[PDB]
Amino acid sequence: ELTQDPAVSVALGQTVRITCQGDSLRGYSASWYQLKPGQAPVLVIYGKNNRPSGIPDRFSGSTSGNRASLIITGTQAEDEADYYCNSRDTNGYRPVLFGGGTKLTVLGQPKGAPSVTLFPPSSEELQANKATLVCLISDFYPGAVTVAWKADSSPVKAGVETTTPSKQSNNKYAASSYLSLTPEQWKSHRSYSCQVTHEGSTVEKTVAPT
Amino acid sequence: QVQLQESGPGLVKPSGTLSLTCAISGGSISSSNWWTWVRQPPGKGLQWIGEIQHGGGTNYNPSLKSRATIFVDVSKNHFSLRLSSVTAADTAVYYCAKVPPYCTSASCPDDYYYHYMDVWGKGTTVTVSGASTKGPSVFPLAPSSKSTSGGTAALGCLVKDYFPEPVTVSWNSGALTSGVHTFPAVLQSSGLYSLSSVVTVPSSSLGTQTYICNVNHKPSNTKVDKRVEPK
Amino acid sequence: APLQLGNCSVAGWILGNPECESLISKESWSYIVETPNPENGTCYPGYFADYEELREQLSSVSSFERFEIFPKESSWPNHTVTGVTASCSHNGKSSFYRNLLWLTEKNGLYPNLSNSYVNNKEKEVLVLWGVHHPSNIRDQRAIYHTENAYVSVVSSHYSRRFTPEIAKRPKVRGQEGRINYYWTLLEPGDTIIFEANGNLIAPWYAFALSRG
Ligand SMILES: *[C@@H]1O[C@H](CO)[C@@H](O)[C@H](O)[C@H]1NC(C)=O
After folding, report:
1. CA–CA separation, C127 vs B74, rounded Å?
2. Last residue of a domain, one of A75, A107, A139
C-alpha cells in the first residue's frame, strides 16, 4: 500500500509539500509524476533528490522513514496538476505501486470575469434539421461558474449540457454550454439567452433568429 | 532518447479482448529495460498493469494477471499488451512506459536501487462499450458583427455526435496556435459526444485571412477540414 | 625525499580512493612513507593482483606523472560512466575511484566496447583496471546486458581474458559484489587495447614513470 492525500492548496509563490506514506518507500525509494489533463505523466523527482533534465529547480524531493515528500518552492500557476508517488516493493514478486494521487491547486491568482460568446445555430446545421446553441465561456478565475438559459424571458432546462471548467493555456479557466433545439423551436421564439454567473455577478448574451 | 508510441483500437466490445502495442524508437527491445504498461480509468488514479524484460520474464498486477498478458516482438521492435474479458471497468487511458533496470543485491552502482519510469508514451484511449463507432459532424461557429470583442473576434468549430472519444482539433494545419482552446466533450443522453474548439483572431482579418479547423477522430479514421467564414 | 602518503596505502593512492585526501604526487621519490591498512586501500572490496610486485616497483621513481589515458566524456559515448557507490564515499556522498570508471549500460544496452592507447610518453606507462563480479545473475543482466560477458586486455607483452564469477558472498563494506584490480607496464611505443561487453572497470587516469 502507498497512501497520499488527494488535495492540497498553496498560495502563488509559496512552498508546498506533498507527502506519500508506505513501507515500500524504504528500499527503492519514491518517484514523482506530474499529470495534467490530456498529457502523459512527467517524471519530476526520483532517487535522492534527482531531477531529470528540463525540470525546474523549484522541485525537490526527500524521504524520511516510510514517508517521502515532493517539495515545490515558489509555486507557479503552471504547477497545478495531479502528483503521484511511485515505488517498487522489495518483498514477494516486487510489484510497482502507485499512490492515490494529490491534486495541487494554486491560490492568490488574479481574478478574471468570464468572456462569453453565444453562437446561434449555423445555417448548415438548420438545413440538417438540427439546432444547437453554443455558449463558450472563457478567461475567468476562479474556475467556478453557473450557467442558465432562457427562451425569450422564460427559463429553459430541457436540452442543456454544460462542461466542467477546465484550464486554458494561460492559466485561466474555460467552460461551454449547449442548448439543443429543433429548428421549429429556434425560429418560434424571439430570442434565446445564455446567462453566466461568476463570483456573484452575471453576464448574459442573447441571439435572435431574425 | 528512447521514445514510445501506443497504438490499438479505441473501442472494445464487453467481454472482448483489448490489444495494444507500444512502438519503440531510439533504442532496442533486446535490452535490460522493464517495458511497462500503465492505465488511468476516468476519475481514478494511475494503475500499474505489468512489466516485461527481454530474457527476464514478466511481472503483473495481481488485480489483473488472470486477464493480462505482456509480450515483446524483437523483429518489429515493440512490446504489446492483451487484456481479455473486458468490462466497463477496463475503460481507461493506457500508457506504455520504460522502467530502467534495477538491482536486487548489493552488487551495483547506486542508481540501480532507484525505481522510476523514465519514458512515457502519450497514451491511447480505450472505451469498453457495445455501441458502434460514429464519426463526427462538424459545423462552423462563425463570427458575426455582434459576436466581436473590438479588435478581437472569436470563431470556432462545433464537433457533433461522435463515438468514442477522443477528438483533437488544430487550426490552419497547426499554423494557428495562439488563442486556441478546445473544450472538453459533453456526453448526451444518446450516448454520443460533442465538443467545441474556439480561436480568437483579429477582427480586422475576418474578410482576408482564411480559417480552417482540423478535426481528427482516430476512433473512426476520420479527418475533417471545415472552413469557417463570417456570417 | 620520500613520497608522503599520510593516512593511505599505496593501493588507495594509486587507484584514487576518494578518502585519500593525500597530496597529489611528486615527480620523484627514493622511498614511500605509507600507512599499511587492514582493508588495503580498496574502498570497494576485491583482490589486488601482483600487489607485492607493484609496491616494490613503485618504491623509487624518477619521472612520475599522472595523466588521463581515456577521457571520461568522450571515450565511452554510448555507455554510462557516472556510476557511484556508498562503499566509496567522499564527504558523505557516494563516489568512486578517481583513476577508474564503472562502465554500465546506457538505455538498457551495453554494446561491445573497444579502446586502445599508444605509449608516446617515452617512458613506461602503468595502466590499471578492474573486473567487476556481481553476486547474482539478474544483476549482471541489469547493469551489463550480457550474461556471459568477457574482458580482454592485450599489449605486446601482456594478454589476458577475464570472465565474471557470479556467486553469493558475505557483505564486505556493505557490498556483495567484488572488483579485482589488475595492472601492467606499457613499454614506450607499445599499444594496449581493452575489449569488453561487460564488467570492465575501465582505466580513466594512468601513470607515466621511470623506475629508479
Ligand atoms: C552509440 O551507438 C548508437 C548506435 O549507432 C548511436 O546511435 C549513438 O549515437 C552512439 N552514442 C553516441 C553518444 O553517439
Report:
1. 40
2. A107
Place of cell 579502446: C115
In Å, how far are A171, B86, C81, C181 from C70, measured between CA atoms?
50, 56, 12, 17
**Contact A197/A145 with Cβ under 8 angstroms?**
yes
Type of residue at B210: T
Helices (H), C49-173: 51-57, 137-143
**CB distance B1 to B119 below 8 Å:** no
CA of A7 to the centre of ligand 1 (A): 44
The whole-angstrom separation of Cα C64 and Cα C82 is 28
How far, in Å, CA of A96 to CA of A31, rounded? 11
DSSP summary character for residue A121: P
Q: Reported resolution in A?
A: 2.5
Give which of B103, B112, B117, B118 to mutate to test C binding, by max C Cβ within 10 Å: B103
Experimental method: X-ray
Write down the CATH number for the domain with range B131-231.
Answer: 2.60.40.10
Query: Which CA distances in Å does C24 have to C13, C21, C39, C95, C125?
Result: 9, 9, 22, 18, 18
Question: How close B182 gets to chain A, by Cα (Å)?
Answer: 9
List residues near ligand 1 (CB under 6 A). Answer: C 77-78
B88: three-class secondary structure by DSSP = helix
Just give the CATH number of C1-212. 3.90.209.20
Q: Say if residues C101 and C71 touch (Cβ distance below 8 Å).
A: no
Gap between the Cα atoms of B42 and A41, Å rounded: 15
Beta bridge partners of B217: B222
Nearest C-alpha neighbor of A175 from the set B182, B147, B213: B182
Say how many residues make up chain C: 212
Query: Does the beta-carbon distance from B104 to C176 stay under 8 Å?
Result: no
Name the residue range of residue A169's domain: 115-207
Contact of B70 with B60, CB cutoff 8 Å: yes
Which residue in B116, B18, B73, B17 sits closest to B7, CA to CA? B18
- Residue count of chain B, please give it: 231
Nearest residue to B61 via CA among B72, B48, B71 = B48
Q: Which residue has the cell 482564411?
A: B210
**DSSP assignment letter at C58:** T
Residue type, C42: T
B-chain CB neighbours of A137 within 8 Å are none
Give which of C203, C113, C192, C99 is closest to C153, Cα–Cα: C192
- CA atoms in the 13 A half-sphere facing the CB of B73: 10
Alpha-carbon A65 to chain mean position: 33
Whether the Cβ atoms of residue A3 and residue A101 lie closer than 8 Å to each other: no
What CATH code is carried by the domain that includes residue A25?
2.60.40.10
Q: Give CA–CA dist C86/C93, Å, rounded.
A: 7
Backbone angles phi, psi at B196, to 5 degrees: -135, 155
Q: Which three cell numbers stand for residue B107?
A: 552488487
